[PDB]
Structure 1
């Protein structure tokens, strides 16, 4: 599914991301834009042979099982395929664990490089929520 901007903002707020670990909703929307273009089916292979999955490009190196990332962990206790669903529940639940792991949203290098320190409220401007 490719979400609209405000549609995704809504969905993320319903699933409890607004101000989760102190990160306003616009931070989450900005990260999803640059990670996936709001496409739940996004995947990208990393250099090490891990894969990033879904709207927030969650990495099989640590967070999910895809059976093809030697040595990796599955800390969210899910198949990586769950992160590609039209329903963002699994992605959100796993993101809450990631953002809680000490580095905050710096876990997402694209957030650090493209969202952090910008006017992230622009991503939810106009949205009914």
Structure 2
């Protein structure tokens, strides 16, 4: 599924990402935009052989099982294929674990490089939630 901007913001709020660990909603919308372009079916292969999956491009090295990432962990206890669903629930719940890892939203490179320090409220401006 390709989400519209305001539709994604609404769903993220529903699932409790609004101010989760102090990260305002616009931070999450901004991340998704630059990671996946709002596409739940995005995948990107990493040089190390790992794969990132879904709307927040969650990495198979640590977080999900794709059965083809030699010597990896499965810290969110899920198949990577669940993170490609139209339903963002599993992506969200895995994201909550990641952001609670100690490094916060710096675990998403695109968030660190393109969202951090900007005016993220612009990402939810003009949306009914």
Shift of 1:116: 0.3
Find the residue that maps to 1:8 and give its secondary structure: helix
Structure 2 residue 69 is the aligned partner of structure 1 residue 89: no
1-structure distance, mates of 2:111, 2:74 = 22
Shift of 1:92: 0.1
Q: CA RMSD in A?
A: 0.3
Find the residue that maps to 1:62 and give its secondary structure: coil
2-structure distance, mates of 1:74, 1:116 = 27
> What is the match of residue 29 of structure 2?
29
Q: Deviations over 1:93-127 (max 9, x none)?
A: 00000000000000001100010000000000000
2-structure distance, mates of 1:72, 1:122 = 37
TM-score by length of 1: 0.99
Flag structure 2 segments of 5+ consecutive residues without an equivalent. Answer: none
TM-score by length of 2: 0.99
2-structure distance, mates of 1:13, 1:69 = 32
Flag structure 1 segments of 5+ consecutive residues without an equivalent. Answer: none
Question: How many correspondences in the alignment?
Answer: 129
Shift of 1:22: 0.5
Q: Deviations over 1:3-31 (max 9, x none)?
A: 00000000000000000010000000000
Shift of 1:40: 0.2
Find the residue that maps to 1:52 and give its secondary structure: strand
Find the residue that maps to 2:44 and give its secondary structure: strand
Q: Deviations over 1:54-80 (max 9, x none)?
A: 000000000000000011100000000
Find the residue that maps to 2:83 and give its secondary structure: helix
> What is the match of residue 102 of structure 2?
102
2-structure distance, mates of 1:88, 1:33 = 14
